[PDB]
Amino acid sequence: QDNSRYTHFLTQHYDAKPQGRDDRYCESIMRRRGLTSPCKDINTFIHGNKRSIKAICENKNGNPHRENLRISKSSFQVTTCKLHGGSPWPPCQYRATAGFRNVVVACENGLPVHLDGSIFRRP
């Protein structure tokens, strides 16, 4: 049964069915998931069904990527929360950006355990 790292990945990166994906959504979910002490600089949540996300670890929905990651074949609805302001401590103000594209994860024992957030921080 699903080890702690996969469980942790879901806590930090999965929100099945969000409502509005605006700035207030970000500020609330970041607190709720305990990512505000200190405030995480940027964090992305994937939406949809868990099934498609786990499938990225297989050839059904993923391709090998770079040194040790996997990239999905299907696109996902996602929301990236970016810290606004110059302080790492609460209150954390976040700005939301909704998107729809494929994602990159690291798999361990057939389960997603890490999300590569670099493809979401548009410099």
- As beta bridge partners, residue 14 has 46
Nearest to 40 by CA among 26, 50, 52: 26
DSSP 53-109: HHGGGSTTSEEEETTTEEEESS-EEEEEEEEESS-SSSSPEEEEEEEEE--EEEEET
The catalytic residues are: 13, 114
CB atoms within 10 A of CB 71: 17
Residues 15 and 29 sit within 8 Å (Cβ to Cβ): yes
Entry field: residues in the chain: 123
Of 9, 72, 76, 81, nearest in space to 47 by CA: 76
Please state whether beta strands 111-115 and 104-108 pair in parallel, antiparallel, or not at all (unpaired). Answer: antiparallel
Question: Where in the sequence is the domain holding 102, given as residue range(s)?
Answer: 2-123
CATH no. for residue 52? 3.10.130.10
What experimental approach yielded this model? X-ray
Q: Any binding-site annotation on 22?
A: yes
21 assigned ligand-binding residue: yes
Instruction: Report the domain count for the chain.
Output: 1
